[PDB]
Amino acid sequence: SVPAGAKCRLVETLPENMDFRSDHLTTFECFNEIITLAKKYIYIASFCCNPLSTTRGALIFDKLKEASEKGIKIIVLLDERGKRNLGELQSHCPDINFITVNIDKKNNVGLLLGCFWVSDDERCYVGNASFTGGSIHTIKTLGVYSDYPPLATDLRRRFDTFKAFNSAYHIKNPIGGVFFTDSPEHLLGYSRDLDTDVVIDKLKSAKTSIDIEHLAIVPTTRVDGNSYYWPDIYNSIIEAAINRGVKIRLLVGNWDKNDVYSMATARSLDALCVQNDLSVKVFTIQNNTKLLIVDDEYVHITSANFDGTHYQNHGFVSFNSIDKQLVSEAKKIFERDWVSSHSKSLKI
Amino acid sequence: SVPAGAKCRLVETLPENMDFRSDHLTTFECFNEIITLAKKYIYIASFCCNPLSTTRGALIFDKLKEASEKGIKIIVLLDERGKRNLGELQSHCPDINFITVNIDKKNNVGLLLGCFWVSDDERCYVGNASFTGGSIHTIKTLGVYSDYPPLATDLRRRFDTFKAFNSAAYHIKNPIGGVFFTDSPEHLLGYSRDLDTDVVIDKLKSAKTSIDIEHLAIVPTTRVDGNSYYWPDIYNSIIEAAINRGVKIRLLVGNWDKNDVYSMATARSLDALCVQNDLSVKVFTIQNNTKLLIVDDEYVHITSANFDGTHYQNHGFVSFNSIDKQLVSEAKKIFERDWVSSHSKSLKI
C-alpha cells in the first residue's frame, strides 16, 4: 500500500569551493523539477526570499516567474522581518503572491522558518535550504524531496497554518517510516506533535550513538537583546554521553561575537571532550545543515537550530524518518562531513 | 492549638578562630540540653561517629555515656562506610547501641547522612552537624532545635526507617506550625513523605525575588561510584531563575580544585554568568558544613546534603523546611553575616 520511505530522497547543496561530494539530488535540481512538473500550484515557505544573490537562484526565480505567467498559482510565505526586498520581488514577478506573516502576535518573538516547498499536493521539498541564492548555490544545505501525495498533502496543511497568519502511536509506527513534527506549541492544533518533545525523547532513548550537525548547541541564546536560558536539548546530549556512555559527535559552527555565553559553552564542551565519549568538531564555512541521527536508526532534518529561541517561539516543520535506508544515507552524509577538511577539532 | 514555628530555634557551630558571631543556641549547648533532659531514649543518626576528635566532642560523648549508665536507651546510627572507629566507640561505651546502616543494598551508592538527634519523642535537633568533635567545635555548622513533641515524633519515624537497614500538595503549602520535613532517597519515602528533590526544585522555580544558597558545591557533575554522573536539575533551576526571571541570586560555595575539569569548567561558567546577570558567587576556604537555602525571604531550607546529583539521587537524609516569618528572618540574617564575612571572597580565577 504505502511505499517504505514515502518516496523520500536526500537533497544537498554542495558548494563548488567545498570538498563535499555526493550523488544526491541537488537543491537546484530539486527546485527546478518541482517548478517544471507543476500543474496547479507551488507553495513556498521560508524566513526570507532573496534568490537574486546568485545566478542559479535567479534562474530558479525566473523559472518560477515562467510558471506564474502560465497560470500556475504560486504563493511565497516570508516572515515580516524579511520584508526588505518585498517590493523588488513583486516588481520582478507581479503574478507571484508574496505574503508576510507574523506567527507571534502576542510576544513578536516567533519567526517563520518553515523551509519547505509543496506543489500540486503531490511533490514537496523540506529541509534547511531557504529560498535564497545562497541556500541554492553557495551555502551547504541538507533536505528531503518526495513525490508521495499523502506526504505533500501533510506539508500543504502546514502551509495553510502558516498562511493564516498574514500580516494584512503514530510516532512509534509512522506511515512509510516518515513523519513530520511541528513548532511552535500554540500552532500545533489537536493532532500535530511538538518537535521539542520528539527530539528530546529520541535523545533520551539513545542507546549507542548520537550524531548532530547543527549551527550551535548552546543552553543560552539572545531573544533580541535579552538572554533566554533553555538547556533541555543541551542536557539531553550531555547526560546521554556521561550517564549512558553514548558515543556523541557534535559538528557545530564557530563561536565568538565576544559572547560570554557561547565562550563559556565552548569551554564546557572542550572540558567534556577530554574525559567522555563526546567529540566536537567545528566548521567555519556557511552551513545551514540541521541534522540529527540516533543509533543509526533515526534521522531528523529541520531548519531550526537546537536552541531555546527556535524551539520555544519559531515556526518550522521538521522531517523525521526511521527508514533504515534513508537513515543509512544520512549516516553516510554525516560521516563525510565529520572527516571533511572544513571540520576541525574543538580548539581550547 | 499548634504553636507558630513549632518551637524551632536555630543552632550554630561558630568556631572561635572564625569571625562568625550570633546569639543562637550552640551545637554543644543543644546536644547538652538533649542529653540532660533525656528520660527514656536518645536516638542519633549521622554518617560517622567521631566525637573524641576535640575536647568539647569528647565531653558530649561522656555525657552520653553517663546517660547510658543511668538507664537511658541510646542508639547511634552510622553508615557502614564510617565503621572505622566502631570498635573504639563500643569499647568506650558498652551500653550505647552502635548500628551500621546500608540504605542502598542494591547499588551500594546511597549513604546515611541523617544528621539529627531525637529523644523521648519530645526534643530533637536537625541540621548538618554530625556526631563528631569537628562538627561540635571546629567546623561551622547550622541546624534547628525543637522541643515540640509532634515534630520530634515525625523525626523519630525517620530514625525507624533508617534503623531498619542495619547491616547485621496540601500539607506542604500550609504546614503544621509552618514547619515540615522532606526526605531522601525516593525508595525510602513510603506513601506519605515528600521527596526533598521536588520541594527544593519547586521552591527554586517559584522564586520571585531572591535566592540565597550556602552549600559546599553547586556543580552539575559529580563522581558517584568511580564514574561521573550528570545531574543539573538544581543547577538549572538556579540559573534559569536568574536569567529568565531576573531573580537576585547569591551563591556561597566552597573552594574547588583537585584538578577537576568539571568543577573548574563550572567555575568559569558561573563567573561568565556574573558579568551580565544579578548572580554573585563567593567562595569559602574554611571547614563549613552549612547547607542553607532561602527563597524570597519567606522560605528556609536547612539540611545535611549538598545540592548535587549524588546526594539527591542516593543518599538518606532529612531536610528542615519552614515558612515561619520569624525563623526565616533569623536564617536570612545568618546568611547576610556569612555573605560579608572575612572567610567569604568573591569568585576569582
From Swiss-Prot, chain A:
EC number annotated for this UniProt entry: 3.1.1.-, 3.1.4.4
Post-translational modification: Palmitoylated. Attachment of the palmitate moiety is essential for correct intracellular targeting and protein function.
Molecular function per GO: phospholipase D activity
SUPFAM superfamilies named among the record's database cross-references: Phospholipase D/nuclease
Catalytically driven reaction(s): a 1,2-diacyl-sn-glycero-3-phosphocholine + H2O = a 1,2-diacyl-sn-glycero-3-phosphate + choline + H(+)
Membrane topology classification: Lipid-anchor
The name this protein goes by in its record: Envelope phospholipase OPG057
Phylogenetic placement of the source organism: Viruses, Varidnaviria, Bamfordvirae, Nucleocytoviricota, Pokkesviricetes
Curated annotation (Swiss-Prot), chain B:
Localisation per UniProt entry: Virion membrane; Host Golgi apparatus, Host trans-Golgi network; Host endoplasmic reticulum membrane
Main location: virion
Induction: Expressed in the intermediate phase of the viral replicative cycle.
UniProtKB keywords: Host endoplasmic reticulum, Host Golgi apparatus, Host membrane, Host-virus interaction, Hydrolase, Late protein, Lipoprotein, Membrane, Palmitate, Viral budding, Viral budding via the host ESCRT complexes, Viral envelope protein, Viral release from host cell, Virion
GO biological process: viral budding from Golgi membrane; viral budding via host ESCRT complex
Superkingdom per UniProt: Viruses
Record-linked PROSITE patterns: PLD (PS50035)
Catalysed reactions listed for this entry: a 1,2-diacyl-sn-glycero-3-phosphocholine + H2O = a 1,2-diacyl-sn-glycero-3-phosphate + choline + H(+)
Description of post-translational modifications: Palmitoylated. Attachment of the palmitate moiety is essential for correct intracellular targeting and protein function.
A Pfam family per the record: PLDc_3
Molecular function in Gene Ontology: phospholipase D activity
All residue ranges annotated as the PLD phosphodiesterase domain in the record: 284-311
Oligomeric form and interacting partners: Interacts with protein OPG190/B5.
Function recorded in the entry: Major envelope protein that plays a role in the biogenesis of the viral double membrane and in egress of virus from the host cell. Produces the wrapped form of virus that is required for cell-to-cell spread. Acts as a lipase with broad specificity including phospholipase C, phospholipase A, and triacylglycerol lipase activities.
Name recorded for this polypeptide: Envelope phospholipase OPG057
Organism expressing this protein natively: Vaccinia virus (strain Western Reserve)
